[PDB]
Design a protein around this motif. Sequence first.
Motif, PDB file in Angstrom:
ATOM      1  N   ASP A   1      -9.481 -14.416 -28.183  1.00  0.00           N
ATOM      2  CA  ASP A   1      -9.905 -14.903 -26.885  1.00  0.00           C
ATOM      3  C   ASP A   1      -8.790 -14.756 -25.867  1.00  0.00           C
ATOM      4  O   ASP A   1      -7.611 -14.964 -26.161  1.00  0.00           O
ATOM      5  CB  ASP A   1     -10.331 -16.364 -26.961  1.00  0.00           C
TER       6      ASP A   1
ATOM      7  N   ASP B   1     -11.110 -20.316 -29.869  1.00  0.00           N
ATOM      8  CA  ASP B   1     -10.606 -20.030 -31.201  1.00  0.00           C
ATOM      9  C   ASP B   1      -9.716 -18.803 -31.115  1.00  0.00           C
ATOM     10  O   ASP B   1     -10.046 -17.838 -30.423  1.00  0.00           O
ATOM     11  CB  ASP B   1     -11.745 -19.834 -32.205  1.00  0.00           C
TER      12      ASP B   1
ATOM     13  N   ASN C   1     -13.395 -24.638 -25.851  1.00  0.00           N
ATOM     14  CA  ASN C   1     -14.192 -23.925 -26.843  1.00  0.00           C
ATOM     15  C   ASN C   1     -13.506 -22.612 -27.203  1.00  0.00           C
ATOM     16  O   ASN C   1     -14.080 -21.528 -27.143  1.00  0.00           O
ATOM     17  CB  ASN C   1     -15.613 -23.691 -26.349  1.00  0.00           C
TER      18      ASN C   1
ATOM     19  N   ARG D   1     -11.079 -20.726 -19.384  1.00  0.00           N
ATOM     20  CA  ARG D   1     -11.675 -19.917 -20.447  1.00  0.00           C
ATOM     21  C   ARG D   1     -13.123 -19.633 -20.101  1.00  0.00           C
ATOM     22  O   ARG D   1     -13.955 -20.546 -20.091  1.00  0.00           O
ATOM     23  CB  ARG D   1     -11.592 -20.613 -21.794  1.00  0.00           C
TER      24      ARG D   1
HETATM   25 MG   LIG Z   1     -15.013 -18.776 -28.577  1.00  0.00          MG
END
Ligand SMILES: [Mg+2]
Lengths: 579, 40, 267, 116, 91, 49, 49, 67, 528, 46
Positions: I162, I158, I156, I123
């Motif tokens: 994303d 959500d 991290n 990510r």
């Molecule tokens: Mg985020």
Amino acid sequence: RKLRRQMDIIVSEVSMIRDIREREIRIYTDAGRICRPLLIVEKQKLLLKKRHIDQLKEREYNNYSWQDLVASGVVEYIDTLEEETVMLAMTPDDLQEKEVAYCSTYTHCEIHPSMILGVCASIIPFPDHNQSPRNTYQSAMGKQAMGVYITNFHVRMDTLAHVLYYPQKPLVTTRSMEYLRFRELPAGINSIVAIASYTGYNQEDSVIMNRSAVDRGFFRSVFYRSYKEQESKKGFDQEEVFEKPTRETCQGMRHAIYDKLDDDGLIAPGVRVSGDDVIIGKTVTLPENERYTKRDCSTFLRTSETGIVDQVMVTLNQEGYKFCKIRVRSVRIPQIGDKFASRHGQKGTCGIQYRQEDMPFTCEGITPDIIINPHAIPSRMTIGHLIECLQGKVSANKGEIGDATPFNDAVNVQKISNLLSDYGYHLRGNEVLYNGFTGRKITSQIFIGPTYYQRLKHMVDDKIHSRARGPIQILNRQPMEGRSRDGGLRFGEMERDCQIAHGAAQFLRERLFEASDPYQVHVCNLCGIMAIANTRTHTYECRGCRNKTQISLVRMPYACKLLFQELMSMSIAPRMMSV
Amino acid sequence: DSACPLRTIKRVQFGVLSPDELKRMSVTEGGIKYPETTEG
Amino acid sequence: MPYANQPTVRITELTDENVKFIIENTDLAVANSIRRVFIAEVPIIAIDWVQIDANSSVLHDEFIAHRLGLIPLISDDIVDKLQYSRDCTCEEFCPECSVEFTLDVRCNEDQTRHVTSRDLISNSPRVIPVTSRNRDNDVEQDDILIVKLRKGQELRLRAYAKKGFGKEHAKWNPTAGVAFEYDPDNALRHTVYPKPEEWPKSEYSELDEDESQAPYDPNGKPERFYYNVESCGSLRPETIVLSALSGLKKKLSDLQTQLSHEIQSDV
Amino acid sequence: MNAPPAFESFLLFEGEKKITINKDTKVPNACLFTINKEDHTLGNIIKSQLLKDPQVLFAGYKVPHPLEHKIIIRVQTTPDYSPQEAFTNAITDLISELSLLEERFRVAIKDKQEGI
Amino acid sequence: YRHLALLCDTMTCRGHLMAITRHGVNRQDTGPLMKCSFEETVDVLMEAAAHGESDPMKGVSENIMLGQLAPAGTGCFDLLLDAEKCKYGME
Amino acid sequence: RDGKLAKPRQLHNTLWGMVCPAETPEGHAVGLVKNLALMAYISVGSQPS
Amino acid sequence: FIGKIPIMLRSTYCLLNGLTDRDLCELNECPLDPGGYFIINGSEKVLIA
Amino acid sequence: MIIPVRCFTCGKIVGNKWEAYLGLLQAEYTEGDALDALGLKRYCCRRMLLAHVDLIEKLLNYAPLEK
Amino acid sequence: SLKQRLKGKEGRVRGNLMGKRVDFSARTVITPDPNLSIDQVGVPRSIAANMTFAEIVTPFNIDRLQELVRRGNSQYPGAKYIIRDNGDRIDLRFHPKPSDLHLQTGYKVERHMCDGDIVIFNRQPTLHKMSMMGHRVRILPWSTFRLNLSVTTPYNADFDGDEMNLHLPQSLETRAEIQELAMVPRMIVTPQSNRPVMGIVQDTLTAVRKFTKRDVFLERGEVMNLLMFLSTWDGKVPQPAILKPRPLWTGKQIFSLIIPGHINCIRTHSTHPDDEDSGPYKHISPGDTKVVVENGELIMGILCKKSLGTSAGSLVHISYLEMGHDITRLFYSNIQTVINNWLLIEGHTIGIGDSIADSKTYQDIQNTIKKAKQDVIEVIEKAHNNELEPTPGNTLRQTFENQVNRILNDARDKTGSSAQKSLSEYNNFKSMVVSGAKGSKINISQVIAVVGQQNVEGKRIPFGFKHRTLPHFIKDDYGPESRGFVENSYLAGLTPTEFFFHAMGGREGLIDTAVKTAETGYIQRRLI
Amino acid sequence: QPMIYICGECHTENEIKSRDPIRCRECGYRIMYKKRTKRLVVFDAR
Ligand SMILES: [Mg+2]
Ligand SMILES: [Mg+2]
Ligand SMILES: [Zn+2]
Ligand SMILES: [Zn+2]
Ligand SMILES: [Zn+2]
Ligand SMILES: [Zn+2]
């Protein structure tokens, strides 16, 4: 001022600023001053009287307009430099009355405080109960919603469009919406939301969407792309023409099904195009010197775009050539991945779609269309979402579109609660729900009600990439975009650093050598110059030392090869010394 | 292929490329002298 | 099999659009399952094949196809004599697994031509008319303004209607709203009301005005499950309930025969 | 588009079996039943009728993934009664229940239609 | 404490108080390929060429650049094969 | 560089009723791209004779 | 003749300045479209203040 | 763009109750009494008409390309 | 100009040599999936039918791999290429008779990704070591990646749009490297802070807080249904807490069957009276505050973020340290499944019924806020009388601001304490804050209390309007309403001056987010 | 039956060939739309 309130100096922005202590008067008559209409207060009493409101009410029959209000001297345009010399009241109902005197010399008065909000921020209802960052996030997302963007969308041929099937007016509407013309061209649906933690698929900003709902039309949308193709004739005999490139008798067919093309070269409206389909067929002519003279230059549709052809247009542009625009229509049903967002700064993605039999239900078979998570409310303090659900409940029951004008002292939460209890529900808006899987009542009482949700234009079918072993670039032989959507993902410096931290030399080697740009080079053990002339007759030879026995193999990126060659081209000799 | 199965580069020595080495290493014998790409 | 329930059912309303019935002496599982087969697995006939060979309406082709497949079709007694179009020994249709429809409307007058249910003409007289075209011998009842089209616009389509469950699509969903309620006075405390006084009182409650809940019944369990089905016209309520019970019987019997094959196939 | 056709939730695919029967070695008399292409409509009724017995020590069910179409029922029974017998007796009890209820409902519909 | 300790000790290791940036690595003995990456590949390359330096290729970024198993992580060791133990292993 | 780094992204008390306080891109151009209030009008120009 | 100045849609000098709703529809235009964008090479352009 | 054929939540056929609804509105009936008179008795079956833009009318004012 | 080909970003050395573009990569939006173990990601079928893995034909794999070659690229579990001994690649789509293709020992068969393969999941921006963890795949159909919820804290992530990157290793050495070095069970305890990097997250956390209360009693059907979900189960139902009148299992019992092995722990719930540990009842807690896990069984306590999430000495932390990575990663997919299915019976909500307080408390709030404003007026009168004395080391403006800010902040704090004591045990705000899921005490305040002073650049709203803050206030107005103070709650609305001032306050937060987003990786790059 | 085009403003089927003055007859408008195909397309009503 007495002149600017009738006519000698243009009643429009000619500001007059008398700066008293500084002892200056500053009259500005120029372009670029943001003015603002404000009422006038003479001796703690408005200049607006019921006569003006009555004349304005009968607007269509009279010839009394805003201009007659400004000519009458009851509303004047105050720019900003004049604003630092005036004492305003927000509401006349107060601040013009008597108490321990705050100010006894007012000079103007706001028409309505909700006019400090712009267009995209006048949509959000109860914007005074929400946190301000959430209000900005809504002003952002409200520009990315789907709806009838204009009425004449069947004669627009735009590069990208989006038309929600069944949009709805809001039920809890801000009174400044009838001026943005939102009741006319809305951008959402009034879904029945329930702030519950049903099964877990709505955690961390996610929503559980009813599949029966989305299967009865809830939030369907069309995606109208529009492609373009010119028929150029740039060089003499270098003529390009629209024509179905049949087969030999033309070269470069590129191995695609040309069954769709009509004789003109354009696909017909109503033909289900696909990935390996050609939409437009051009045949440019060879230089006629040194198959026939017609090459093939046909527009190919990318697999990321599928659908059915809606319009085909042919016409002459301003450059004079013939010029077509096809329109490919694609119907999008909401499914796992699509972004939905309320008017209050809360965005989510549909994580699962349960069916009506599986969703919760009230005593009356009402099933939620969306189940947003409770954990979204506390850290964001969007308490305009809750109040919107409550007012929408009272409105759907009563029958009047609720009023959520921002600063209104006659819409209290207690009044909404009493109105709701007048109609047989729990006053705060909670209801006893059941679990469709088993049937048992859910112990706590779930907050449910009609809220205004929007479908943002971030659909997941426009975001999937996947590259296994695809088109390679000619110069670098690094990955490159191709027909299919994916050309690769960067393995940047930060990811390299993370893989260094792990301690995975082999995976980092794969990612930076063998999944991007693998190559073998023959190098001379004596001079590190790789200018070996390897051959499939098995003659490894190094011109530069007269040595055919001391050549070794070296694996290195073709990027490193190209770098060492671009260096050798500057007389810098990189010597890969295997010893 | 069969040329001392791959050895890994352990050092990269930099230097200026002499004229004699470049001439011997070059594959164009006389050196490029016709500014055109192809004639026929 | 000495451990079955002997339920008792009594009805309280039998309008041609809803039934209201109380199923007593039953488990909660069976009540919720009967509700789920109301909403999900009662077979109804609906359109699932459209071929629009002339469309000038301001609505595109998929729009009309969808809005048209969501028309309700009288499917009263000709869904037990139809076969799912997959198990037919035919190719894509036949008078045994389909009901051919046609539509042909063009506006040659100035005023808008509302295209309605009436315009859909079927191939089988009683088997399916489009609902809201129940009968003329016994209100606009245009089961939808399927398209509004002005002068010069035409619509020609040819629709086929197969039989389906409601798990395949919301088309084949007989019920509008299946209402469900047990323990309306909250005796079992399956919900724990904060401030039990503010909560409204259920239609089926048997409680005085001063009292808010019922006293805790520690030994009791769910019984006397209340219902109120509705219909989208496609099937009368009584038939909806009867077909739901027959469908659950068929599901369980197929499960038992496959289980017998499995147990006897194994050692 | 990776979107399954809606008919997968109730139709068997190629030769996939409707009900399969394993044996779990954790406890003496347990038996896992994989019912394929079903959901809670057929899970909780079998569970809540497998639980009215005085010999079934463990009846419960699980839909392992809501995007898949599968359930597993676990039946542990006394050393006399086999899990297969418990399951089949539960299914017969449910069929008898529903047959009784259908007859009662026909009687009630006719009574409401005419006798009133 | 390990991480603050290592970072401070790396900064204060050559006696100086080195700006731990590109300005720092410009004042180290790292080879031409390392400084080739930072700011101006061609200038450091030409300077190292006219002088005739060498990059021992013991660094990590150099081995990563030339597509070879970086001297750190899983590559710090080399593996051999055993014959006497391969005797005990017919099949 | 014409604006000498006077903090432009902050909301200024002077923006009342002239610019919307709750409409600005949430990315890098925060506070820079401002939208006009609902009753805000720009002067067109008038000669001062 | 000295040139061709672009024309802002629904300005006083457009072909749409004094036309009603039905006239706009006859010319195939949305009666709710605001105006204020030039048409340069087919693409609508708005001049940000 | 046209009155949906069914309530999104409770499946009630609501597409036939829109011209009758406009008729009752131009009959001095209020919106609450008009919705109760048409049989709509829930949130969802009521929001379909209470909040419905009927754009097909402002979308029929354009001439058709086929004659 | 070759020197320019070899130049800065989009150059060779930095662009095409250090950070490349890679094959076998995918990217789609993340959507939650509580039914997947922490070491699993859900790949759609398109991304799995695109990506492949070169598998060698040993005499073990030969029948299976020939069946895969037979299937072809068309059906999902198949193969895309067959690579022969010499290394010459055969394309399984363009063979005239694909049946004639026979594979020997040594050939490779690039086969579509199938359930069980290892992939590295990333990510951006990848900041710490725990942002390229590796998972197993599970091909479940819809066009979005799907990862467990306890794994959102490391990335991290959500699930509001994303996208997350999937790299598929393409050799046995790299697959083994990722399996034994980078899998997500092996990356629970971060070396950065001695802490578990991934703990139980919001919904399961509020659910376990409500579930470990001593008043939660389950019955036979419920306990069987829950035990059906935990994967590490002996198969023996425990004897219930309450036997007669009715078999009733308590919540801590069922939770004791998901604690892995014999773990010994002692913790403290958030709502623990500080003097509870000093007087009597030190070990028989009258509110279940004290958590005591003694020999794998939750003897006494109520679980929260301070007991099973991302903290030193936590139940998850010592679960790892004592019982190993595999047992610990089973300890996450059992809590989630069990409690997240019990949440169907309990349920969790949030409504206006919680953003309200009883009338006595609202009057107490208003009385405190009246006293605070009168005292600010008192300070202003002492300042205009020139009887205010400068606190040592500060000007008169500084001591004036200090006193007015101290009064306002003590007002907000006491107002918030009264608000928080106005709550009921059934309130959901309080449930989510005493659990640990989301929200702080300051938010329970700002919903039913004063919102508070709106500071901009560390000061009250400046006189940016020529000696006033807005044209509605009169000049030289240092009072509360004239420089930021928002006495209204979020439920009771915000007056138009307070709304503009709250916007002025939140714009600074947006700017701060922008600058932090701009500086994310600066120090990290500079000192790597 | 050659390619049948429709004029955007007089709405007449014009039926012009491969080589063509793309203008329309009896109304010289250059903007022309193609006519819907006559091969059947099948929409699942869902
Ligand atoms: Mg985020
Ligand atoms: Mg998150
Ligand atoms: Zn050499
Ligand atoms: Zn048939
Ligand atoms: Zn409804
Ligand atoms: Zn014409």
